[PDB]
Amino acid sequence: MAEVLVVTSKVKKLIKEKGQMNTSAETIDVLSKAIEQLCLKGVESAKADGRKTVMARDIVID
Amino acid sequence: EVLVVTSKVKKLIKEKGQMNTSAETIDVLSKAIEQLCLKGVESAKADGRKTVMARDIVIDH
DNA sequence: GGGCT
DNA sequence: AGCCC
């Protein structure tokens, strides 16, 4: 799907290796929505600063 | 290390923002995913489950 | 590599 | 001049 923004295999490997847990399909969808929201907040910060580039300091996790 | 699909993130930010994406931006997004997944493991384990589910990924903040 | 922010 | 397409 063109909608998936996370590397499914690497996310499942992290959760398996660090948690001994499986990962639901819906977990991948929520993580992809999280990325989309972070990128859109990033665009707003960069635009407010009059920049053309989304930089690390534009991505704030509360 | 990289947990986001770099080409799709750059396409989203280019298409939705008419902006470039810094290399460090990709690293911060990957750190964000790692932290969300590890908080997910905590919630799932606390609930006695063997699967990280959507309700384990808390993002409303 | 070839420009750009 | 460091860094992005």
Residue B34: inside a domain, yes or no?
yes
Decide: A37 and B7 in contact? Cβ < 8 Å.
no
Residue A27: inside a domain, yes or no?
yes
Residue A2: inside a domain, yes or no?
no
Residue A18: inside a domain, yes or no?
yes
Residue A1: inside a domain, yes or no?
no
Q: How many domains does chain B have?
A: 1
Residue B1: inside a domain, yes or no?
no
Which domain, by its residues, includes A53? Answer: 8-58
Q: State the CB neighbour count (10 A cutoff) for residue A41.
A: 16
d(CA A54, CA A26): 28
Q: State the CB neighbour count (10 A cutoff) for residue A15.
A: 22
Residue B10: inside a domain, yes or no?
yes
Residue B61: inside a domain, yes or no?
no
**Resolved by:** X-ray
Q: Decide if B37 touches A, using CB distance below 8 A.
A: yes
Furthest C-alpha separation in chain A: 45
Q: At what angle do helices B23-46 and A25-48 cross, to 10 degrees?
A: 140
- A48's tokens: 């407010």
Structural resolution in Å? 2.0
Mutate to test the interface with A, among B22, B24, B27, B60 (most CBs of A within 10 A): B22
A8 CA vs C4 C1’ separation (Å): 33
Decide: B19 and B13 in contact? Cβ < 8 Å.
yes
Which nucleotide across the nucleic acid strands is nearest to B14, CA versus C1'?
Answer: D5
Decide: A4 and B33 in contact? Cβ < 8 Å.
no
